[PDB]
Design a protein around this ligand. Structure first.
Ligand SMILES: [Mg+2]
Length: 113
RNA sequence: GGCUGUCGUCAGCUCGUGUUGUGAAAUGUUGGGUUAAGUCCCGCAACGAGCGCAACCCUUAUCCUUUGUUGCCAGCGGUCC
């Protein structure tokens, strides 16, 4: 029917009660999201995301999780956007005004070697 | 006032921004290694920075350059030696 063979679920008994209205089933202790009803969500964050993206807005991807770090840098910066696949950093957005220094440093430094 | 002793030549002491907490405060600055060292790296709701330790000052250990007088005396002779 749908491309579900590319996955099956994850987790087990740690989960979090916050998720319940969407449970495809339960096996091997690992819970399985009810993609059968997740269909709307599978596009929801895309539709209302289109107007934003199509509006040509700065893209902010985050893949600090080593389990897919570099495996996303491409689909991000290399994809004409931004990212942070490596290791996230505190204050990057909040203490932004401060991080600028460090950021502006990796630039004016490239001219080194 | 200015000056100085004192721990202490100790590696400490802080601050701005962000964030957590009602608040007093905390974080950083804690931690894993490492160093003479807040030394360096790694990690981290922290990001950075200021005073301080590490440098430049002196001086000694070498080698060269030049300058050779009052300093020097090797090859040359002289020589009251
Ligand atoms: Mg230091």
């Amino acid at each position: 029917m749908l491309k579900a063979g590319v996955h099956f679920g994850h987790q087990t008994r740690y989960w979090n009660p916050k998720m319940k209205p969407f449970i495809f089933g339960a096996r091997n202790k690992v819970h399985i999201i009810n993609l059968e009803k997740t269909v709307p969500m599978f596009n929801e964050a895309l539709a209302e995301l289109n107007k934003i993206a199509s509006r040509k807005g700065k893209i902010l991807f985050v893949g600090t999780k080593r389990a897919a770090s570099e495996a996303v840098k491409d689909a991000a910066l290399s994809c004409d956007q931004f990212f942070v696949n490596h290791r996230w950093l505190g204050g990057m957005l909040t203490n932004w005004k401060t991080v600028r220094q460090s950021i502006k440093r990796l630039k004016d430094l490239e001219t080194q070697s």
